[PDB]
């Protein structure tokens, strides 16, 4: 099975620069060339950089203004892209590529890069639990506010992801540069009232790790 | 329509520095015209501010009961008090609501509340001898008591009536209980 | 040294056949090999076909693709289009560079029809502490997309505060949230407030309430 890791991404402010890492395993290395391909909501899907399968040879898109290098690891399975003298315009998902001789046949997961002057902001976390009823249903619905942080992205896991059945991440809304999101988990009103159920929000650009147990509204 | 819309103009929160707080409107008041239009609920009165602001007008006359009126006084005329038609094209408000009363909306089979009969529907006028008239003094009355046994005066279709209650620990919670829940709806 | 242009919207039948095409502006189609990634929302792109006509291993056979050289465009044709085929298609060739088309999004018309679910919290605890109070309101499992989103404070309309996802999907059908910021007096001084989604010529809606049970 193939699997491409990237790492590396983040905030930075214009002017600075990013190296962008692709680990690669589930297929021998040396044998193809790789590259980085980008996207945006407006501008779509864009390629960055090639390089060959020996490394002898390198190949930069157009909008790269040869501010980035590309360059690869055989011994290390892993090859690089240096992001220097980065402007808002690069605010992007990047993604690494294996090639085939004619096409991308296979794509990492895609690392958030946002160059922005505006400072990160961590978000605040708060519980989400029903409001008491006299009523009570066979699976609950819990939740983690995730309020006000910046830049994009956030992840939260249930229960260090131990709870991963019926978690659904919600897109983040945007108001005055600060996004808030909710996650929610659908567990048995069981699982609930037999053992913790915690949300885990990690936002990597402020450091921020937090965990917040859900706990039962009272009277 | 939420059922509380639809009841007297009784005020039970009035927002600092609005068009109500300046004119001197206080919890507690109920507004029974306005220019126009005669106020019998919420709505009509919401209906009534509405229609004055897209008419143009921009001040009118508000009537209101303050407090308890004398046996034999109580049909005695009420003066105008001069208010600012609320600007409802830029969201402006008056600045009253009615905050949840202290009407039962539902009763926990086997609280205390269930035990001595309490019965969705039910006003509760005194907790303790204290009269109320918002949900939030009924809760505050019953978390004062903390274990101690509760009069409640209560009013069912036209009658009053007394209960007397002993609130039941929540071992899940460390806290007391009484078993009531609010009509929101 | 050239662009790749595709429609940027395309809406099919569901079990019908659909063709997106992929036009090349300058050179010919066929000088150079063109291939075809399926992207569904939040996801890597996958390969449909490569090499013109290709099928990798593990794409269904209603998949193809093939050369149009009087219309200077390759085309991705979908037999018997199902829920799941509903993402976006990107083309690709190149030369001397590497060239994407814009991409097309894909609606599969007529799916069973899916009423949203809501789901409401009040504000928490820890953030009433600091005076503040954010109602949520998560919609979840409709289709189709299209839905407003409203709130309503003692039963009416209000704007102020409100901030609401546009519908996203996830599996097979579609999430939003929406959020109402208020004070903690706000929040105390109201009844109840009202999470509203209409969607397909229906209402569905969930109150929250600042009075508690005692």
């Known amino acids: 099975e193939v699997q491409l890791v990237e790492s590396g991404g983040g905030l930075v402010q214009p002017g600075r620069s990013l190296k962008l890492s692709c680990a690669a395993s589930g297929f021998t290395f040396s044998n193809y060339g790789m590259a980085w391909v980008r996207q945006t909501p407006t501008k779509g899907l864009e390629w960055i950089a090639s390089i060959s399968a020996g490394g002898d040879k390198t190949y930069y898109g157009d909008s790269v203004k040869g501010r980035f290098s590309i360059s690869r690891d055989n011994a290390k399975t892993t090859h690089y892209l240096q992001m220097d003298s980065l402007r808002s315009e690069d605010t992007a998902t990047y993604y690494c590529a294996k090639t085939s001789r004619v096409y991308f046949d296979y794509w990492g997961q895609g690392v958030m890069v946002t160059v922005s002057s505006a400072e990160t902001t961590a978000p605040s976390v708060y519980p989400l639990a029903p409001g008491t009823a006299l009523k009570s249903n066979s699976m609950v619905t819990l939740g983690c506010l995730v309020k006000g942080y910046f830049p994009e992205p956030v992840t939260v896991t249930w229960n260090s992801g131990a709870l991963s059945s019926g978690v659904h991440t919600f897109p983040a809304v945007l108001q005055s540069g600060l996004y808030t999101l909710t996650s929610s988990v659908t567990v048995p009103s069981s699982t609930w009232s037999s053992q913790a159920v915690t949300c885990n929000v990690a936002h990597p650009a402020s450091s921020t790790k937090v965990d917040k147990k859900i706990v039962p509204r009272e009277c | 329509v939420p059922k509380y819309l639809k009841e007297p103009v009784v005020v039970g929160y009035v927002q600092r520095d609005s068009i109500a707080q300046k004119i001197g409107i206080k919890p507690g008041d109920k507004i029974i015209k306005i220019n126009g239009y005669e106020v019998r609920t919420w709505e009509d009165l919401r209906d009534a501010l509405i229609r004055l602001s897209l008419d143009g007008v921009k001040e009118t006359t508000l009537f209101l009961e303050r407090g308890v009126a004398m046996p034999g006084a109580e049909d005695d005329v009420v003066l105008h008090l001069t208010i600012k038609v609320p600007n409802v094209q830029k969201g402006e408000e008056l600045g009253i609501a009615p905050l949840v009363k202290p009407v039962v909306g539902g009763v926990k089979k086997g609280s205390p509340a269930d035990q001595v009969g309490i019965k969705p529907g039910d006003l509760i006028l005194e907790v303790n001898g204290k009269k109320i008239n918002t949900w939030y003094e009924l809760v505050e009355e019953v978390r004062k008591s903390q274990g101690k046994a509760i009069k409640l005066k209560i009013l069912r279709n036209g009658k009053m009536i007394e209960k007397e209650l002993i609130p039941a620990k929540d071992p899940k919670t460390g806290t007391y209980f009484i078993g009531l829940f609010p009509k929101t709806e | 040294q050239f662009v790749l242009t595709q429609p940027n919207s395309v809406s099919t039948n569901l079990g019908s056949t659909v063709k997106l095409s992929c036009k090349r502006s300058?050179?010919?189609?066929?000088?150079?090999?063109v291939n075809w990634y399926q992207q569904h929302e939040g996801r890597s792109p996958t390969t449909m076909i490569y090499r013109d006509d290709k099928r990798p291993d593990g794409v269904p056979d209603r998949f193809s693709g093939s050369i149009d050289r009087s219309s200077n465009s390759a085309l991705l044709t979908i037999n018997n289009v199902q829920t799941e085929d509903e993402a976006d298609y990107f083309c690709?060739?190149?030369?001397?560079?590497?060239?994407f088309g814009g991409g097309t999004k894909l609606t599969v018309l007529g799916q069973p029809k899916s009423t949203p679910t809501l789901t409401v919290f009040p504000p928490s605890t820890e953030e009433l502490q600091g005076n503040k109070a954010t109602l949520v309101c998560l919609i979840s499992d409709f289709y189709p997309s299209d839905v407003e989103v409203a709130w309503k404070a003692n039963g009416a309309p209000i704007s102020q505060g409100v901030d609401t996802a546009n519908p996203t999907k996830q599996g097979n059908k579609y999430i939003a949230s929406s959020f109402l910021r208020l004070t903690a007096e706000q929040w105390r001084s109201r009844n109840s407030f009202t999470c509203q989604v209409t969607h397909e010529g229906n209402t569905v809606e969930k109150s929250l309430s600042p009075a508690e049970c005692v």
């Open positions: 300058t050179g010919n189609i066929g000088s150079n090999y």
């Open positions: 690709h060739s190149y030369s001397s560079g590497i060239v």
